[PDB]
Write an enzyme that holds these catalytic residues in place. Structure first.
Site, short mmCIF file in Angstrom:
data_model
loop_
_atom_site.label_atom_id
_atom_site.label_comp_id
_atom_site.label_asym_id
_atom_site.label_seq_id
_atom_site.Cartn_x
_atom_site.Cartn_y
_atom_site.Cartn_z
N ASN A 1 9.09 -71.66 9.89
CA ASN A 1 10.33 -70.90 10.02
C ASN A 1 11.67 -71.60 9.72
O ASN A 1 11.97 -72.66 10.27
CB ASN A 1 10.35 -70.29 11.42
CG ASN A 1 11.44 -69.27 11.60
OD1 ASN A 1 12.53 -69.60 12.03
ND2 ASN A 1 11.13 -68.02 11.29
N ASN B 1 11.75 -62.09 8.61
CA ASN B 1 11.85 -61.54 9.96
C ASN B 1 13.23 -60.86 10.02
O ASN B 1 14.26 -61.51 10.23
CB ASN B 1 11.76 -62.67 10.98
CG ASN B 1 10.46 -63.48 10.86
OD1 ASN B 1 9.37 -62.98 11.17
ND2 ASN B 1 10.57 -64.73 10.41
N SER C 1 15.45 -64.76 9.72
CA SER C 1 14.81 -66.03 9.35
C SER C 1 13.64 -65.69 8.44
O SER C 1 13.28 -64.51 8.30
CB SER C 1 14.30 -66.77 10.60
OG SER C 1 13.19 -66.10 11.19
N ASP D 1 9.61 -67.26 7.18
CA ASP D 1 8.51 -68.21 7.36
C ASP D 1 8.06 -68.59 5.95
O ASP D 1 7.77 -67.71 5.15
CB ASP D 1 7.36 -67.54 8.10
CG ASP D 1 7.77 -67.01 9.44
OD1 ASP D 1 8.44 -67.74 10.18
OD2 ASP D 1 7.45 -65.85 9.75
N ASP E 1 15.76 -61.37 13.24
CA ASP E 1 16.66 -62.50 13.40
C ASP E 1 17.11 -63.16 12.09
O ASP E 1 17.68 -64.24 12.10
CB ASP E 1 16.05 -63.55 14.33
CG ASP E 1 15.06 -64.45 13.62
OD1 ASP E 1 14.31 -63.95 12.76
OD2 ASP E 1 15.06 -65.66 13.92
#
Length: 130
Positions: free
Chosen positions: A60, A46, A51, A53, A49
């Protein structure tokens, strides 16, 4: 590893997922199906932000596992995110149980609300011997 539907259903059942905190096995199957297509090696970065998964449930790194590269992240399941990339899903199942112990329950996953909530999920476990 990419699980076959019924193979996964029995694997989750043996791991104590059937009815865990009121969540049926069919719901967990619908979740894994839509999150990764039953692929334990699945990952999604992602960029917004920073992060990622991880695994079959697409858990996450911002809150659940540590990958060392997510800014100000937490590690509530107290696991390296690497543990969520194993063919053996025991650690992933432990973490998924941790996620649902929180207020939202199974709703913690937006994909569950989008494709499993108020849906006919019987099809996910039919013929699996569970």
């Amino acid at each position: 590893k990419v699980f076959e539907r019924c193979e996964l259903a029995r694997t989750l059942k043996r791991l104590g997922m059937d009815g865990y905190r009121g969540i049926s096995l069919a719901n967990w199957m619908c979740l894994a199906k839509w999150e990764s297509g039953y692929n334990t090696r699945a990952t999604n970065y992602n960029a917004g932000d920073r992060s990622t998964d991880y695994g079959i449930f697409q858990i996450n790194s911002r809150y659940w596992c540590n990958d060392g590269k997510t800014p100000g992240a937490l590690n509530a399941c107290h696991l390296s995110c690497s543990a969520l990339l194993q063919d053996n899903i025991a650690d992933a199942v432990a973490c998924a149980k941790r996620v649902v112990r929180d207020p939202q329950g199974i709703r913690a996953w937006v994909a569950w609300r989008n494709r499993c909530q108020n849906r006919d999920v019987r099809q996910y476990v039919q013929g699996c011997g569970v």
